[PDB]
Design a protein around this nucleic acid. Sequence first.
DNA 1: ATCTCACACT
DNA 2: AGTGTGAC
Length: 425
Amino acid sequence: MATGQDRVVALVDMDCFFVQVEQRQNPHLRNKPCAVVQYKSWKGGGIIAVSYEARAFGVTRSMWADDAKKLCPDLLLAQVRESRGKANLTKYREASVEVMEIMSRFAVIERASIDEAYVDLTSAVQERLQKLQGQPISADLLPSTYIEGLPQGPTVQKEGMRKQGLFQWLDSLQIDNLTSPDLQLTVGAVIVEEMRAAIERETGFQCSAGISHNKVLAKLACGLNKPNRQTLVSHGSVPQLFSQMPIRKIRSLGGKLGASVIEILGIEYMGELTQFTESQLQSHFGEKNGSWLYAMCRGIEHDPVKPRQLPKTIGCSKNFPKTALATREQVQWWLLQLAQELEERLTKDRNDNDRVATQLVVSIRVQGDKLSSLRRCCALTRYDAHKMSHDAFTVIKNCNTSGIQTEWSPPLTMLFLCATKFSAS
DNA sequence: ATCTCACACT
DNA sequence: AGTGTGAC
Ligand SMILES: Nc1nc2c(ncn2[C@H]2C[C@H](O)[C@@H](COP(=O)(O)NP(=O)(O)OP(=O)(O)O)O2)c(=O)[nH]1
Ligand SMILES: [Mg+2]
Ligand SMILES: [Mg+2]
């Protein structure tokens, strides 16, 4: 009997992160419809973060600020800082570190993005259980927790509903069994309340969280009640939850694979995968995908929370959409600009994190081509922008089809520098 | 598309 | 090594 109740996993994700960062810094933006964009010289900038007040007006990510202004006239905007003609995300990376370090105090975390991390609470839950000494869990220890699927069976407002569901869960809880998966999830949720409380006290940032037995369910849970709430997804809530859950909502199925699952099998919801054998899914999607899908639709997933808090690579990119680079002098200048930010971030990384990058990856796009046109690596022996930028030029310089030694053809529409292969130092 | 980062696969 | 996908 397959179980998938072996771990306690949480996913903490910051609410409207970039917006919150700007709001802490500028109190005038607090509790208002606001958004964060970069490069306003074109269409007021492209929206990448939206406060929940602004979302009420229908303002979304990927929307032009000028178009967003049509939906929400009083929409306030904070713009991503610009350096060397490029976007600078320094303020946000640093705010992220604040959050990651607080979370790191409770357990080993996997930085999943700039504003979220997975937490393996299995050992931490076990520790708390003996301390409890068979003591019941008060609802007071879960003041922002939702239990998905509850209340059920035999008030109207949301908070009243939340409490009623929480009480049904706690009233039915068997605290006698220290190996009860449902009990383990509850204690995990109590810890996450503490973890989320610590984040807000020490940063001012609010976040949501999902607590379940694996990463996928935890991630899904987190989005069930946003913002400033956490959701517990038990093993038992899975069949109902997945019964009307679109396949695309599940992490990693939001793209071509998920579309392929829908098209080939003629289904719409995650629960509908259960009627197929593992071999069947393997036949359509391969040995690896098939096994993963077979277990996942039953709420089972084994991807571990990796002990990794730091980025594996450090990269900078810029597009050049009639603005395309057509001279060697142009190509060299922008490679230098990219190299300058790269050196800046690398040096700080070396001091902070006791490591040194060893490989420099260069990538370019050509006006005719469809993301990357060419990607080449070279050795990274010194944190020097001039050296790195000259190196970037050298390995790509053979692309220049122009006979004349001053022009570049055909024009470049993207430059990209990435530092990889870190070694301890 | 006028805006980093991980990982499978090769 | 280089390409493609997926998410954020
Ligand atoms: N440059 C760029 N930045 C982005 C993009 N998408 C997101 N960001 C940046 C902006 C975001 O602030 C940050 C976190 O991304 P989320 O967690 O997926 N969205 P948020 O936390 O804002 O809202 P909530 O979580 O409540 O839904 O990543 C993008 O396409 N491009
Ligand atoms: Mg977020
Ligand atoms: Mg996120």
